[PDB]
């Protein structure tokens, strides 16, 4: 785990890190989920397995939490399901905040960008509501959803810049692989 960038944005200390988000020292981590919180692949599978031992168990608790929180078995972009982080709690991660980005499949548009913007902003607003001081994100939609990584990072930064609050004090973007983290660093440097 390595921190590549740190800056102040409003009341927030914003970091870019390369490494495994399930090991990042934040009180909440964000999951790049699908709309049904079926954690069958990607960072969503990694988080689910880290939290529950078997990803399917975390899918099951996620679906119960989503029904309780939203009254149905899917979420729309910007809605955030909160689940106990279970096995990650001992590392100081109390919650997983599940969000859902759009599927770009190699395309980009203003409509795709706004969906992704909501998927980044929603977890900041949920952190504020809950008094969670520190939160870490993955590059939502830059996995199999095929949204261009630079555009994804730009959109994340727009959400962080627009957000205002008194409880959230630390935000991180955590990217697993070095080459992608270095692309993110390029975006951070030209934007902050």
Swiss-Prot record:
Listed name of the protein: ADP-ribose glycohydrolase AF_1521
Function: Removes ADP-ribose from aspartate and glutamate residues in proteins bearing a single ADP-ribose moiety. Inactive towards proteins bearing poly-ADP-ribose. Catalyzes removal of a phosphate group from ADP-ribose 1''-phosphate (Appr1p), but with low efficiency.
Effect of substituting residue 20 to A: Strongly reduced affinity for ADP-ribose
Pfam families with a match to the protein in the record: Macro (PF01661)
Any one GO molecular-function label of the UniProt entry: ADP-ribosylglutamate hydrolase activity
EC annotation from Swiss-Prot or TrEMBL: 3.2.2.-
Macro domain: residues covered: 1-192
């Amino acid at each position: 785990m390595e921190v590549l960038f740190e800056a102040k944005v409003g009341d927030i200390t914003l970091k870019l890190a390369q490494g495994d988000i399930t090991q990042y020292p934040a009180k909440a981590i964000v999951n790049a989920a699908n709309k049904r919180l079926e954690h069958g692949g990607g960072v969503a599978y990694a988080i689910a397995k880290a939290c529950a031992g078997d990803a399917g168990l975390y899918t099951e608790i996620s679906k119960k939490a989503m029904r309780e929180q939203f009254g149905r078995d899917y979420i729309d972009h910007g809605e955030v399901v909160v689940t106990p982080a279970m096995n990650l709690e001992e590392r100081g991660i109390k919650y997983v905040f599940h969000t859902v980005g759009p599927i770009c499949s190699g395309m980009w548009s203003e409509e795709l960008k706004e969906k992704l913007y909501k998927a980044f902003l929603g977890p900041l607003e949920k952190a504020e509501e809950m008094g969670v001081e520190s939160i870490a994100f993955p590059a939502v939609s830059a996995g199999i959803y095929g949204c261009d990584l630079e555009k994804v990072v730009e959109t994340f930064l727009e959400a962080v810049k627009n957000f205002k609050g008194s409880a959230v004090k630390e935000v991180a973007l955590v990217i697993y692989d070095r080459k992608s983290a270095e692309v993110a660093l390029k975006v951070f440097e030209r934007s902050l």
